[PDB]
């Protein structure tokens, strides 16, 4: 998932918005 | 905006920034 993706690979701030409430 | 390399507490900082008062869920495997 994104915790993994952001650290092992790269992620965007837009991808992070998916985790907002 | 640009792509991010974010591990550990740095990821939760970015979540805080992006989501702010909306709040967010931090859910690792
Ligand atoms: Cu550090």
From Swiss-Prot, chain A:
What are the disulfide bonds? 6-11
Domain of life the protein comes from: Eukaryota
This protein is called Insulin A chain
Q: Which organism is it from?
A: Bos taurus
* Lineage of the organism: Eukaryota, Metazoa, Chordata, Craniata, Vertebrata
Gene (UniProt): INS
Swiss-Prot record, chain B:
Q: Which organism is it from?
A: Bos taurus
What is the protein name for this chain? Insulin B chain
* Taxonomic superkingdom: Eukaryota
């Amino acid at each position: 998932g994104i915790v993994e993706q952001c650290c092992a690979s790269v992620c965007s701030l837009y991808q992070l918005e998916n985790y907002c409430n | 905006f640009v792509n991010q390399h974010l591990c550990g507490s740095h990821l939760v900082e970015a979540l805080y920034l992006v989501c702010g008062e909306r709040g967010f869920f931090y859910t690792p495997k």
